């Protein structure tokens, strides 16, 4: 779910509030996403969107009435490392992995303030 992803990002980037800093950035970071990523952070978001689209195709994911942003899973942050738990059932484990890769992606690319609240007509 959205609250775990928020925690995963804070695990890698302790100085940020992800829901404020990364929401509505470029063409992909945020609800939906279309067009060409405007930069590397936006591209992290695009990969994350694709990952969630893949999860939806899974037989296991389609058995639970739960949106990826509400489907809770278990993970831990220890010494700024993210660990998805083995207690996670197949769907939740796929989602946890998507979220983990994105948090790490986010922390490795440049943040361009010019792309915050990007005019969706650039997409």
Query: Residue 111 Cβ, how far from Ca ion at the closest point, in Å?
Result: 17
78's contact among Ca ion, a copy of itself, none, with CB below 5 to 8 A by partner kind, is: a copy of itself
Query: Residue 8 Cβ, how far from a copy of itself at the closest point, in Å?
Result: 9
Query: Residue 93 Cβ, how far from a copy of itself at the closest point, in Å?
Result: 11
Residues 6-45 that bind Ca ion (CB under 5 A): 28, 33
Structure letter (DSSP) for residue 2: H
Catalytic residue numbers, as ranges: 48, 99
Ramachandran category for residue 78: left, alpha or beta (phi over 0 → left; psi -120 to 50 → alpha) = beta
Q: By three-state DSSP, how is residue 3 classified?
A: helix
Pick the closer one to a copy of itself by CB: 38 or 91. Answer: 91
Task: Give the Cα separation of 68 and 63 in Å (integer).
Answer: 13
Task: Give the Cα separation of 95 and 85 in Å (integer).
Answer: 12
Closest Cα to residue 99, out of 114, 85, 113? Answer: 85
Sites of contact with a copy of itself (CB under 8 A): 7, 10-11, 74-79, 83-87
Instruction: Report the interface residues with Ca ion, using CB under 5 A.
Output: 28, 33, 49
């Amino acid at each position: 779910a959205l609250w775990q992803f928020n925690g995963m990002i804070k695990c890698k980037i302790p100085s940020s509030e992800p829901l404020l800093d990364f929401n509505n950035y470029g063409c992909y970071c945020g609800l939906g996403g279309s067009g060409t990523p405007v930069d590397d952070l936006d591209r992290c978001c695009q990969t994350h969107d694709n990952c969630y689209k893949q999860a939806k195709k899974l037989d296991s994911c389609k058995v639970l009435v739960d949106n990826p942003y509400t489907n809770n899973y278990s993970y831990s942050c220890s010494n700024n490392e993210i660990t998805c738990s083995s207690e996670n059932n197949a769907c939740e484990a796929f989602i946890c992995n998507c979220d983990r890769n994105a948090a790490i992606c986010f922390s490795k690319v440049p943040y361009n303030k010019e792309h915050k609240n990007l005019d969706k007509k650039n997409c």
